[PDB]
RNA sequence: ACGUACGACCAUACCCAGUGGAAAGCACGGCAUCCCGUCCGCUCUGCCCUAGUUAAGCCACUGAGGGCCCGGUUAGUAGUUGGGUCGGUGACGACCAGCGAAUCCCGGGUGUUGUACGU
RNA sequence: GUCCUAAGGGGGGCUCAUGGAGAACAGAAAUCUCCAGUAGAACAAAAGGGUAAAAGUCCCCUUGAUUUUGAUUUUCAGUGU
């Protein structure tokens, strides 16, 4: 890294105590349906700021060999993946792939309904501004499984996809859009993804009355093939680093409201 | 309801000495009169943040500017022992300067508009003498 | 549609070039000659590559040029064609409509000879445009000139013959 | 050799459509709309300023996923309702258009049942916040004296909080880092155009007539420009939504649909294309 | 006095906090009413000692503004 | 119309991610009518959004600043995986190990400044770098030289490059040590 | 439906040529005092919107050659594993599956669309 | 063995290598003009999709060469502001 800009790039790509906002790459296979392309376009419109997009055809089957996926993650520093593909057995597939240290942490397949799918342009409403973080609502009994399963992994993928940039404060005008995922415990259950803009009205008390209006896209999914993480890799990924601003509690030592260090005697 | 001012609207230069007095016109906030130590008073259009008129004629620091209650006159009291009256719509001095004070004229006070009699206004000037 | 007034040929610019090939006093004198010939300060052009045969170096000022527009360009072109006696060659004209020529002496242009400056020749190049050439030059909404609005070799030869009353051989 | 071959055409990657049209700087647009100092999930507004040969277009724009939205718009040809009929592209007409857009934005917001979460969660120690927007000059050059800063100055005087510095206003001196507010006032009320009119009337009479023929025809003296622009500012601040009608022909929307469809001629169908191909084949055979 | 910043003769003298002539010290300037451009209150600034305290019995300083 | 949603099982929240979890079952009707299907889905979404809005407006502190009315959010509590490992201290170099063994303290930032006072010129100069003190006398008009030094000096070489030669030798030794440390750390 | 200003998809939109364009709008344009910037008012910037002009830009349509984008076929086939298997000295010859292509061939097409203001 | 108001950073303007056609000396190779030019140049890295009104190249400003604060993280401190 002789160049200063290259040094900045490697320092941005370096591991950190507080990680950067998460980047997703949207890519296609050799054969991919137009409905799948529209679905990936809608997801990219949801996640424009922290996404990159490929435009070529890739001869990648993630459940056979994901070496090219790991290479793409290492090259583009992307760590969420949305892989579109189509086949005779599975006509509309969205493969959600999550990295850890430029290797495959876990994978999941979603099967898009071609009949009930409606894009964002199919709804004549006011759309979400670019870069705005929507709120999330997960509904049903499929996300409360005692054992980690496909629905728990899908909930983790969707939360991580719509995570956005974390912040300690939010404007009250940034609470206008909600993404609702509904899924029931059960032949295969239907996972439904909807987005609603929020209209708020008077109700005669302090809290306001909330009304919703569909914003798009309209998506129905069947959960398919799942690649589970290794337990050691999952433990290393779910390790939590401590900020230097998070102090270490010492016995009989505190800080008062004037900033003085105070010791306790007994 | 008057909402709290929170940011700079306009920073307007033009005076060569520190500003010693400022007062808005009673009609609206569009016109603002300031008297400074550069022997002058100045009228400012606050809508565009621009100067409008420069009133010159005093030879001491203009300690006070005061609008008439109807808004048709501007009185300036200065340290050259004088008081001057100006038309703010044209920037011109009305009649001659008010002479008779022996020392610095420090304060001005117009008579209330409903108390005006004999077809004229009255102006009280408090001085160092 | 060929009689439209916006298709009228005109001189875009005239570029005067002196390539002395050696930096220093000779280049300075050539720049001087360009300065009192045009009326504006000239431009020093550096050599792109190193050629040991020509005795040049990279980033070494070897040439000088002036771009002249308006009626001044027409006046300088008139002076140059008066020097060349209104005779050009078919080999000189380009396929894009521009043309040019070269001279070996400049005192015959009307400049009194000064022994402290000396003898210098130069290349004249005239560019031809129609009204509407702003489309390919403006910053915003820059586009390409249409095929029917371009200038051909036959068109510029005809324009030269009808305007300067010269001959082409 | 020939460089525009099949391999080159296949490997070619087109730019964005507006980049090919030369209308949008996406490098500036990405930093304008997707970058923020804080992450409070707040909406962002931009004052888009554009210029034509005969009009000034000022808009208040938010960026959404499917395309931009216009909160309010103002045009310099609407100054005829407020009395400005000439010089609809000069720096003072830019000031008046910016002021008009600022007044229209404030009137639409009501700052001159459905209600907001700000009003829902407003505290006792809360005050009214100004409307905030960032300037979008597009591909224009940001030099001192440019009319984009006149639109910005007019909007800021109308009451829109636009973050800016004063070193690009006319009359600013870079040597002393001071702004000549006398020159600024002269430009605001159009005194540069009046001074040009007086200088032309002194020196070049026929060029004065050719340049300001409409001013003389409408009897607009150079000494009345300041009063005319001040009265225009007062009328704009009084009635920001005054209706204006132009001299163009007026029809309804469906009447213009019929009028434009009368001159639009349709695309050829498959049967007509096959008939033309067969005719071309027969002509080639014959 | 808030702290001793730089004794010009020796870093050991700076560490010991010796107050001699030419020493840069940090002083509390709350009583001077200094407000920054952003609206914050500047209560700590730098001063230079202009006297000899070992000869005078008092410390005299000039603010570095 | 009410602003409170009653469910058999209460909602759970993670206000850092603005996430509301509804463990109650979504009784999707067994009909092919998309209108009533989306009516039910929109009702469930309305209940979730209403309870989330009430939770945000009631259990977060509110500050009205010039930026607007802001809710202060708690840090997120939902476990999600990282994607780069928690950084570890680098392998301890040869100098670092030697200094830890010998009790050699790191220099202070004032001590390691690239600045020194030249008495003879009465000026402040840099110890190294552009016009550094390590290249002193390479550009001054006069250098005296020793007769033995000029006799032992190879032909072509001058005295005006000796300091640069010494600097390049020290720099080469420095990267030799640095590359050895990097290779050993890579093996570790 | 047409035009303009911001846009979304980012070639069905790109490369080449021809024909036409009511209305208004864009645009070519005219002038260099002031603001501003160049070797050159070429570009940028300022003033005019009067006068000429649809010649070019722009839009629509057509035409080859490319390119590009969709659907079927290829084909559940080559190929890779399970090694489930029936016999077989064992191997092998065959079924049973799980993933899963591409070349070639056929057919269609050469832009949809959001906000605001106008014609 | 010579050269530099250093690199870096921010902003703005421009588009490169090459090919064709033109221009006194100038002739494969000097400079200038136009057209075509997905980068085939340059700069970093080792793409299987790096960068084109730029991450390339020149102008304007800074060059102050390693700022201050911290009850917080880690290590140390017989010289613990």
Swiss-Prot record, chain A:
Brix domain span: 22-232
Predominant localisation class: nucleus
Any GO MF annotation of the entry: rRNA binding
Lineage top rank: taxon: Eukaryota
GO biological process, one term: maturation of LSU-rRNA from tricistronic rRNA transcript (SSU-rRNA, 5.8S rRNA, LSU-rRNA)
One cellular component term from this protein's GO annotations in UniProt: nucleolus
UniProt keyword annotations, A-Z: Nucleus
Subcellular localization, as worded in the UniProt entry: Nucleus, Nucleolus
Description of how the protein assembles with itself and partners: Component of a hexameric 5S RNP precursor complex, composed of 5S RNA, RRS1, RPF2, RPL5, RPL11 and SYO1; this complex acts as a precursor for ribosome assembly.
Function: Involved in ribosomal large subunit assembly.
Family from the record: Belongs to the RPF2 family.
Name recorded for this polypeptide: Ribosome production factor 2 homolog
Biological source species: Chaetomium thermophilum (strain DSM 1495 / CBS 144.50 / IMI 039719) (Thermochaetoides thermophila)
Covered range of the whole protein: 7 to 300 of 350
Swiss-Prot record, chain B:
Cystine crosslinks: none
Keyword Repeat attributed: yes
Subcellular location: Nucleus, Nucleolus
Superkingdom of this protein's organism: Eukaryota
Coiled-coil annotated residue ranges, if any: none
Single GO biological process annotation from the record: ribosomal large subunit assembly
WD repeats (start-end): 14-54, 57-96, 100-129
Keyword entries, A-Z: Nucleus, Repeat, Ribosome biogenesis, WD repeat
GO terms under cellular component: nucleolus
UniProt keyword annotation of Repeat present: yes
Self-association and partners: Associates with the pre-60S ribosomal particle. Interacts (via WD repeats) with uL18. Interacts (via UBL domain) with MDN1 (via VWFA/MIDAS domain). Interacts (via WD repeats) with NSA2.
Annotated family: Belongs to the NLE1/RSA4 family.
Function: Involved in ribosome biogenesis. Required for processing and efficient intra-nuclear transport of pre-60S ribosomal subunits. Interacts with the AAA-ATPase Midasin, which is essential for the ATP-dependent dissociation of a group of nonribosomal factors from the pre-60S particle.
Name assigned to this protein: Ribosome assembly protein 4
Originating organism: Chaetomium thermophilum (strain DSM 1495 / CBS 144.50 / IMI 039719)
From-to range in the entire protein, with total length: 131 to 259 of 517
From Swiss-Prot, chain D:
GO biological process terms on file: ribosomal large subunit assembly; translation
Pfam families: Ribosomal_L18_c, Ribosomal_L5e
Ribosomal protein found in the keyword field: yes
Chain ranges passing through the membrane: none
Any one GO molecular-function label of the UniProt entry: structural constituent of ribosome
Major subcellular site: cytoplasm
Cell compartments where the protein resides: Cytoplasm
Top-level lineage group: Eukaryota
CC annotations in GO: cytosolic large ribosomal subunit
Protein keywords: Cytoplasm, Ribonucleoprotein, Ribosomal protein
Family: Belongs to the universal ribosomal protein uL18 family.
Subunit and interaction comment: Component of a hexameric 5S RNP precursor complex, composed of 5S RNA, RRS1, RPF2, RPL5, RPL11 and SYO1; this complex acts as a precursor for ribosome assembly.
Functional summary from the UniProt entry: Component of the ribosome, a large ribonucleoprotein complex responsible for the synthesis of proteins in the cell. The small ribosomal subunit (SSU) binds messenger RNAs (mRNAs) and translates the encoded message by selecting cognate aminoacyl-transfer RNA (tRNA) molecules. The large subunit (LSU) contains the ribosomal catalytic site termed the peptidyl transferase center (PTC), which catalyzes the formation of peptide bonds, thereby polymerizing the amino acids delivered by tRNAs into a polypeptide chain.
Protein name: Large ribosomal subunit protein uL18
Source organism per UniProt: Chaetomium thermophilum (strain DSM 1495 / CBS 144.50 / IMI 039719)
Source lineage: Eukaryota, Fungi, Dikarya, Ascomycota, Pezizomycotina
From Swiss-Prot, chain F:
Keywords linked to the UniProt accession: Nucleus, Ribosome biogenesis
Subcellular location: Nucleus
Region (Disordered): 72-93
InterPro entries the record matches: Ribosom_reg
Keyword Nucleus included in the entry's annotation: yes
A biological process from GO: ribosome biogenesis
Transmembrane segments: none
Family of this protein: Belongs to the RRS1 family.
Subunit annotation: Component of a hexameric 5S RNP precursor complex, composed of 5S RNA, RRS1, RPF2, RPL5, RPL11 and SYO1; this complex acts as a precursor for ribosome assembly.
Protein name as catalogued: Ribosome biogenesis regulatory protein homolog
Organism: Chaetomium thermophilum (strain DSM 1495 / CBS 144.50 / IMI 039719) (Thermochaetoides thermophila)
């Amino acid at each position: 890294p002789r160049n200063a800009r290259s040094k900045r790039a490697l320092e941005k790509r370096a591991p950190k105590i507080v990680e950067n906002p998460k980047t997703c790459l949207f890519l296609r296979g050799t054969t991919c349906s137009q409905i799948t392309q529209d679905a990936m376009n809608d997801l990219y419109a949801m996640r424009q700021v922290h996404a990159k997009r490929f435009h070529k055809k890739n001869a990648i089957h993630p459940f056979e060999d994901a070496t090219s996926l790991c290479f793409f993650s290492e090259k583009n520093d992307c760590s969420l993946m949305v892989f579109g593909s189509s086949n005779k057995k599975r006509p509309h597939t969205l493969t959600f792939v999550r990295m850890f240290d430029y290797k495959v942490l876990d994978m999941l397949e979603f099967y898009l309904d071609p009949d009930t799918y409606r894009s964002i342009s199919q709804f004549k409403t006011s759309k979400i501004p670019i870069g705005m973080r929507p709120m999330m609502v997960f509904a049903g009994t499929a996300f409360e499984s005692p054992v980690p399963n496909a629905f728990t992994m899908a909930k983790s993928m969707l939360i991580d996809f719509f995570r956005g940039e974390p912040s300690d404060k939010i404007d009250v005008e940034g609470l206008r859009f909600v993404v609702v995922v509904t899924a029931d415990e059960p032949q295969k259950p239907i996972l439904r993804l909807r987005v609603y803009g929020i209209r708020t009205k008077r109700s005669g008390t302090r809290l306001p009355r909330v009304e919703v209006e569909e914003h798009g896209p309209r998506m129905d999914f069947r959960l398919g093939r799942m690649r589970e993480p290794d337990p050691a890799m999952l433990k290393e990924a779910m390790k939590k680093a401590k900020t230097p601003q998070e102090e270490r509690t010492k016995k009989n030592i505190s800080m008062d409201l004037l900033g003085d260090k105070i010791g306790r005697i007994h | 309801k008057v909402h709290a001012v929170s940011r700079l609207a306009h920073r307007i230069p033009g005076h060569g000495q520190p500003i010693l007095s400022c007062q808005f016109s009673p009609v609206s906030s569009s016109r603002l009169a300031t008297g400074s130590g550069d022997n002058t008073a100045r009228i400012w259009d606050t809508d565009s943040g621009t100067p409008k008129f420069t009133l010159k004629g005093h030879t001491g620091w203009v300690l006070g500017v005061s609008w008439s209650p109807d808004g048709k006159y501007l009185a300036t009291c200065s340290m050259d022992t004088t008081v001057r009256v100006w038309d703010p719509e044209s920037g011109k001095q009305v009649n001659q300067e008010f002479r008779g004070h022996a020392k610095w004229v420090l304060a001005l006070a117009w008579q209330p508009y409903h108390l005006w009699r004999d077809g004229t206004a009255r102006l009280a000037s408090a001085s160092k003498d | 549609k060929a009689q439209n007034p916006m298709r009228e040929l005109r001189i875009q610019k005239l570029v005067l070039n002196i390539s002395v090939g050696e930096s220093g006093d000779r280049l300075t004198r050539a720049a001087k000659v360009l300065e009192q010939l045009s009326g504006q300060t000239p431009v020093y052009s550096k050599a792109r590559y190193t050629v040991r045969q020509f005795g040049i170096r990279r980033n070494e000022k070897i040439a000088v040029h002036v771009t002249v527009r308006g009626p001044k360009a027409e006046e300088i072109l008139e002076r140059g064609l008066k020097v060349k006696e209104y005779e050009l060659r078919r080999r000189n004209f380009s396929e894009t409509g521009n043309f040019g020529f070269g001279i070996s002496e400049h005192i015959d242009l009307g400049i009194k000879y000064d022994p402290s400056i000396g003898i210098y020749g130069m290349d004249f190049y005239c560019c031809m445009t129609r009204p509407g050439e702003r489309v390919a030059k403006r910053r915003r909404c820059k586009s390409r000139i249409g095929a029917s609005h371009r200038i051909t070799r036959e068109e510029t030869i005809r324009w030269f013959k009808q305007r300067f009353d010269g001959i082409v051989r | 050799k020939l460089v525009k071959n099949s391999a080159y055409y296949s490997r070619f990657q087109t730019k964005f459509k507006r980049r090919r049209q030369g209308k949008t700087d996406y490098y500036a647009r990405k930093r304008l709309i997707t970058q923020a100092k804080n992450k409070y999930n707040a909406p962002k507004y931009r004052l888009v300023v554009r210029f034509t040969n005969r009009d000034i277009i000022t808009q208040m724009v938010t960026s959404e996923i499917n395309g931009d939205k216009i909160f309010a718009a103002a045009y310099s040809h609407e100054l005829r309702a407020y009395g400005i009929n000439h010089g609809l592209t000069n720096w003072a007409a830019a000031y008046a258009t910016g002021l008009l857009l600022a007044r229209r934005v404030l009137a639409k917001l009501g700052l001159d049942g459905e209600y907001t979460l700000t009003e829902a969660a407003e505290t006792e120690d809360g005050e009214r916040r100004p409307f905030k927007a960032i300037l979008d000059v597009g591909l224009a050059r940001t030099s001192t004296g440019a009319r984009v800063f006149g639109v910005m100055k007019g909007a800021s005087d109308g009451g829109i909080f636009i973050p800016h510095s004063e070193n690009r206003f006319p009359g600013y001196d870079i040597e002393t880092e001071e702004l000549d507010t006398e020159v600024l006032k002269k430009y605001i009320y159009g005194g540069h155009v009046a001074e040009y009119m007086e200088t032309l009337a002194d020196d070049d009479e026929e060029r004065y007539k050719s340049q300001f023929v409409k001013y003389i025809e409408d009897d607009v003296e150079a000494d009345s420009l300041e009063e005319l622009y001040a009265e225009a500012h007062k009328q704009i601040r009084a009635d920001p939504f005054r209706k204006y009608v132009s001299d163009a022909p007026k029809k309804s929307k469906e009447e213009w649909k019929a009028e434009s469809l009368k001159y639009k001629k349709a695309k050829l169908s498959r049967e007509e294309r096959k008939a033309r191909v067969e005719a071309k084949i027969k002509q080639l055979l014959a | 006095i808030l702290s001793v910043k730089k004794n010009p003769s020796n870093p050991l003298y700076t560490q010991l906090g010796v107050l001699t002539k030419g020493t840069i010290i940090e002083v509390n300037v709350s009583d001077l009413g200094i407000v920054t451009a952003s609206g914050k209150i500047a209560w700590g600034r730098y001063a230079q000692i202009t006297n000899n305290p070992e000869n005078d019995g008092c410390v005299n300083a000039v603010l570095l503004v | 119309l009410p602003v409170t949603v009653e469910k058999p099982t209460p909602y759970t929240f993670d206000l850092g991610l603005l996430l509301a979890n509804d463990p109650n079952p979504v009784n999707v009707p067994k009909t092919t009518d998309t209108q009533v299907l989306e009516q039910h889905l929109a009702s469930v979404a309305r209940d979730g959004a209403q309870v989330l809005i009430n939770q945000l407006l009631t259990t977060t502190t509110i500050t009205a600043t010039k930026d607007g009315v802001l809710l202060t959010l708690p840090p997120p509590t939902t476990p999600l995986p990282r994607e780069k490992p928690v950084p570890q201290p680098k392998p301890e170099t040869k100098w670092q190990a030697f200094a830890r063994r010998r009790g050699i303290k790191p220099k202070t930032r004032e001590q390691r400044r690239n600045l020194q006072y030249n008495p003879t010129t009465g000026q402040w100069e840099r110890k190294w770098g552009y016009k550094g003190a390590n290249k002193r006398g390479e550009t001054d008009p006069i250098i005296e030289v020793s007769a033995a030094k000029e006799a032992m000096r190879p032909e072509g070489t001058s005295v005006r490059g000796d300091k640069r030669r010494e600097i390049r030798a020290r720099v080469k030794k420095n990267q030799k040590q640095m590359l050895r440390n990097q290779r050993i750390a890579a093996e570790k």
